[PDB]
Design a protein around this ligand. Structure first.
Ligand SMILES: C[C@@H]1c2nnn(-c3ncc(F)cn3)c2CCN1C(=O)c1cccc(C(F)(F)F)c1Cl
Ligand SMILES: C[C@@H]1c2nnn(-c3ncc(F)cn3)c2CCN1C(=O)c1cccc(C(F)(F)F)c1Cl
Ligand SMILES: C[C@@H]1c2nnn(-c3ncc(F)cn3)c2CCN1C(=O)c1cccc(C(F)(F)F)c1Cl
Ligand SMILES: *[C@@H]1O[C@H](CO)[C@@H](O)[C@H](O)[C@H]1NC(C)=O
Ligand SMILES: *[C@@H]1O[C@H](CO)[C@@H](O)[C@H](O)[C@H]1NC(C)=O
Ligand SMILES: *[C@@H]1O[C@H](CO)[C@@H](O)[C@H](O)[C@H]1NC(C)=O
Ligand SMILES: *[C@@H]1O[C@H](CO)[C@@H](O)[C@H](O)[C@H]1NC(C)=O
Ligand SMILES: *[C@@H]1O[C@H](CO)[C@@H](O)[C@H](O)[C@H]1NC(C)=O
Ligand SMILES: *[C@@H]1O[C@H](CO)[C@@H](O)[C@H](O)[C@H]1NC(C)=O
Lengths: 320, 320, 320
């Protein structure tokens, strides 16, 4: 007869822990972010074998874009090429693009590593070096790695404020990330301040486990997961978020898979009645905000179904 | 023996109402929107203590961007500053940025309310007023409230057409929000026309409960929830959407939390061989389209499981 | 007594096939795409009744934008209008905008098919043709169809590489689309190579069922569904994706519903100290990446609940 009570105790433990008496429903989320911080860029680079100085001040309008699709982008490094115009120009000296005569490459060939339409004419590029010219924007962008000191390294000091509004459409419940009457002067901490939504990017990378400088050198992808485990029952009601960080970057470190996060941005203008384009290769950090959760509310039908499923179980337990 | 029939009646009530005989599947959605309307802007503003006239016509290409991430943006107000260039300039007179001598502020200090790198030199700004200069884009943008009459108030008359395509991957079912052979000349109404997807922004604000002018003064965020409650069984098949509107804005009304929705847009160009930037502080309404739903189809396994779980229930009910 | 074994056989059938012993949890996805390919555009068009030649080379920075909201856009056709400035100009000759005298149209009228504010003055447009002028950007963009040969037809030869990172937050499981030590030189095939994520757009349209030329003529919307059916149990562990393609475009083919996918892009500049705008009507293909799935792991509670639910079932089966 002791088993008759042990089974009932296990049933009660299951009902309490698993919350089998509640209907659980998914979450509908909306995110709004604001990034603040200014960076003083001052460095020296080598463009086309010539030393150049990059100096300036970047404010919020110079390194980011408004949030779109629960994600915002923070720019950290750039390579600029100015004065490009459509025409004919030799390709960059490379093993695939090198030639000794015009027969080395054929007209109309398209190479994956090239940004021009080949025309088959091996012209001298520089210092008795011959490459076969292509029809594209000229001059061809120099193939170089990102600067070894990150240009916008101070971006590790920027602060992002996140507002999350969640709704459970089946129930009549909607709430927000920032409750009224809460401090707005915060720097997020795992234990000291786990609820104020102001995050520091360097702190995010510190908790996750990487170094901000190395990632910002070639860009990357990170994600801020906001988990909502909400109990909406009147007796025990609690609906608060939990913040975690996870690097979504693949860390391929292989040139064939395009490691890191980067893209190309184009600005078109006119000079001396000639159309021109300037190309900025931008390396940055892409922050995703993955908001997930569920909400449970008491339901009579679910409780009845669970009790019915348990009734035969403990009946057999008594019988056996 | 009457309880033996009452339990069975409740059994059938639960089975019919809760649809316990149906496997339920989430929804995969795709949204495509088109916003139309032109606004004639004509007003007078005060920039740097001087009266200026803003007059023009804004078409679809001048106040919105293509939909990205199930959300589109509608511009409603702006503050323009043209002719900025990198250099040294005094900051705007403010309690934090004010000084009587050069010792008031230190070089290299960064202030959250300032957009420049401080250099520590208290120079005259205007009319025997001294502030310590910073290195940034100059002249520093004037911090002022949005114009009391909303510039793009006529944006309340714009019309948005929404096309939603939903799919249930587990089942072989996909459908669209606009069925064939339906009127395309519509203005959405709660009761008169609840299925045609052409919405008027002013009407959205009217059903939601706010006023378009006040929200458009400082921006805001709304969400157009499209709920799909679809029964895919052949006997009783119905898959139609229901439209609701909900304001996702936090309505903080506190300057520390950045009330409303706004951002900064930058346009870079060259003038007299000098690089320059023009900055537009844009206030607008961000419309989100939260599409959620589920689809249920008859499943033998679910029906068998429910019947088995309730068999012990009514057996005990008869026994007791 | 044979039924006593048949019921148990169906019991095992349901438990094995339906995986009723597993707790199933949804998926959290992050997508990162890279599109490559250059198109040599060379064609002749008719603008304002005059023959013009469009020739150039488009690289990755000239026909696409960085991925935002699990979707990327590839431009395929464009119509350019340059030199627009704010002012008064007659509208395009149309049945709605035609007039014989100034009384034909009234000042301030807003027509849906026009992009200007009517001022009520029927002036000559061209060759003894009278339309009433409007205040807007001038000259009014010509109402013409897209060029019959798609300008960026070669966009069917572009290649897109997709990296998907999925996480099951409830369990301690995260994985990626590209496993280590796998070939990166691929062209996706239904049977020959179903796991390498390099897709050719022409191949996507071939598997889906349409022709790339017709779709690219007026634009369209497509979706690449990545389905993750993952079993995380140690005995039988497999978590691999399956790729499918589906056209999300409505295919309305009715002018009132705006068939295809297109938008208007604006570039603002200054010429001779006069503000000017150039408008590009862009037709392109919007690729969506709908990632969905679920992950199941063994749970004792679910197994106990299913066993309790089915115990009464087979008990009645024996009794009956
Ligand atoms: C136009 C060019 C540009 N175009 N897009 N874009 C961009 N990229 C990615 C984004 F997420 C947002 N914005 C930028 C960045 C700033 N840009 C600048 O010229 C610039 C501005 C300030 C200071 C300096 C300095 F320090 F070098 F002198 C420069 Cl060079
Ligand atoms: C370049 C500047 C600009 N840059 N971005 N942008 C923008 N902002 C947010 C978006 F969602 C989309 N587009 C705008 C708006 C229009 N712009 C204008 O100059 C302009 C155009 C027409 C009429 C007038 C008028 F009435 F003032 F004379 C002006 Cl001032
Ligand atoms: C500025 C203008 C422009 N502005 N935005 N934009 C755009 N649209 C949609 C996107 F998804 C991304 N980018 C474009 C495309 C290229 N553009 C060009 O001028 C251009 C460039 C190269 C060759 C030629 C050629 F062949 F005609 F000579 C031209 Cl005409
Ligand atoms: C970030 O700020 C701290 C002080 O708040 C400063 O010591 C540090 O140098 C800054 N980071 C960079 C990259 O300059
Ligand atoms: C915020 O925190 C400060 C100290 O960090 C504390 O003195 C203050 O009471 C808190 N609340 C408000 C509203 O400032
Ligand atoms: C919107 O249109 C109505 C007429 O359709 C007009 O009376 C009203 O003034 C317009 N709104 C604004 C802000 O002008
Ligand atoms: C659309 O509505 C009008 C009146 O609002 C009605 O006369 C017409 O029959 C409806 N259907 C179509 C296809 O126009
Ligand atoms: C795409 O490439 C193939 C060869 O790889 C070529 O035959 C075809 O003409 C190209 N497509 C277009 C539209 O030129
Ligand atoms: C890739 O495929 C080629 C042939 O398609 C094969 O020879 C090679 O072994 C594969 N793996 C690698 C790593 O190249």
């Amino acid at each position: 007869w002791i088993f008759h009570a042990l089974v009932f105790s296990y049933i009660s433990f299951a009902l309490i822990s698993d919350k089998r008496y509640q209907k659980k429903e998914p979450l509908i989320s909306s995110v709004h972010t604001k990034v603040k911080g200014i960076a003083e860029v001052k460095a020296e680079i080598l463009e086309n074998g010539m030393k150049k100085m990059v100096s300036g001040v970047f404010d919020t309008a110079d390194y980011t874009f408004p949030l779109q699709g629960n994600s915002f982008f923070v720019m950290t490094n750039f390579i600029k090429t100015e004065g490009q115009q459509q025409g004919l120009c030799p390709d960059f000296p490379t093993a695939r693009t090198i030639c000794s005569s015009d027969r080395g490459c054929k007209k109309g060939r398209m190479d994956p590593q090239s940004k021009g339409i080949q025309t088959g004419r091996c012209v001298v590029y520089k210092e008795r070096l011959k490459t076969c010219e292509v029809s594209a924007w000229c001059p061809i962008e120099e193939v170089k790695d990102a600067p070894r000191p990150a240009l916008l390294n101070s971006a590790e000091n920027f602060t992002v404020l996140i507002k999350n509004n969640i709704d459970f459409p089946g129930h009549n419940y909607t709430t927000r990330n920032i409750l009224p009457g809460v401090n707005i002067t915060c720097t997020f901490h795992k234990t000291q301040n786990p609820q104020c939504p102001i995050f520091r990017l360097g702190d995010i990378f510190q908790e996750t486990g990487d170094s901000f400088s190395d990632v910002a050198i070639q860009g990357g992808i990170m994600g801020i997961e906001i988990y909502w485990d909400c109990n909406l029952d009147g007796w025990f009601h609690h609906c608060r978020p939990k913040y975690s960080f996870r690097r979504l970057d693949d860390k391929t470190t292989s040139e064939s898979l395009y490691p890191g996060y980067n893209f190309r941005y184009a600005k078109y203008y006119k000079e001396n009645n000639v159309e021109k384009r300037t190309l900025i290769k931008v390396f940055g950090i892409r922050f995703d905000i993955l908001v997930f959760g569920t909400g449970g509310k008491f339901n009579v039908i679910q409780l009845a179904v669970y009790i019915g499923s348990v009734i035969s179980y403990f009946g057999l337990a008594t019988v056996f």
